[PDB]
Design a protein around this ligand. Structure first.
Ligand SMILES: NC(=O)[C@H]1CCCN(C(=O)[C@@H](CN2CCCC2)c2ccccc2)C1
Ligand SMILES: [Zn+2]
Length: 139
């Protein structure tokens, strides 16, 4: 679990969005596993606007933050799960690191701010849904 809080926006994994999130919806994209809902209070996370490929992510299943190198956002095949059939997920970045179901929502950050959130994993890999292209989150 986990979310990004920027301005009057809450960014969560689409597959973990609550009933309150769908009742206050801004934008959602199944192919990216992202959902954005509106908030009454202002958030303080800063979104990174960069091409960094190194950062630190939060891993709830180890209660630890890990430094990682990650790939550029791309269309990656993701195995079928209880939330989606087998499909290509877009804007996804992979790193070598521990992740388990429950870790989705963990933030990945670089020197410029928030890069994305954990969205996939397994076999010693972790995948992050990028949010650096969503320039509208800043206005
Ligand atoms: N964005 C998605 O489509 C994800 C939705 C949740 C599930 N998902 C995953 O990758 C799982 C692993 N899979 C579950 C069934 C086959 C392996 C997982 C593992 C570790 C960390 C996080 C998630 C896919
Ligand atoms: Zn950066």
């Amino acid at each position: 679990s986990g979310a990004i809080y920027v301005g009057n926006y809450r960014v969560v994994n689409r597959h973990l969005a609550t009933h309150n999130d769908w009742a206050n919806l801004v934008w959602e994209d199944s192919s990216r596993d992202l959902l954005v809902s509106s908030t009454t209070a202002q958030g303080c996370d800063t979104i990174a606007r960069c091409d960094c490929q190194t950062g630190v992510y939060y891993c709830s299943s180890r209660r630890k933050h890990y430094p990682v190198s990650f790939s550029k956002p791309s269309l990656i095949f993701v195995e079928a799960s209880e939330y989606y059939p087998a499909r290509y997920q877009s804007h996804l970045m992979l790193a070598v690191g521990h992740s388990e179901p429950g870790d989705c929502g963990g933030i990945l950050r670089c020197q410029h701010g928030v890069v994305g959130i954990v969205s996939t994993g397994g076999n010693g890999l972790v995948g992050f849904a990028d949010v650096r292209d969503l320039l509208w989150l800043d206005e």
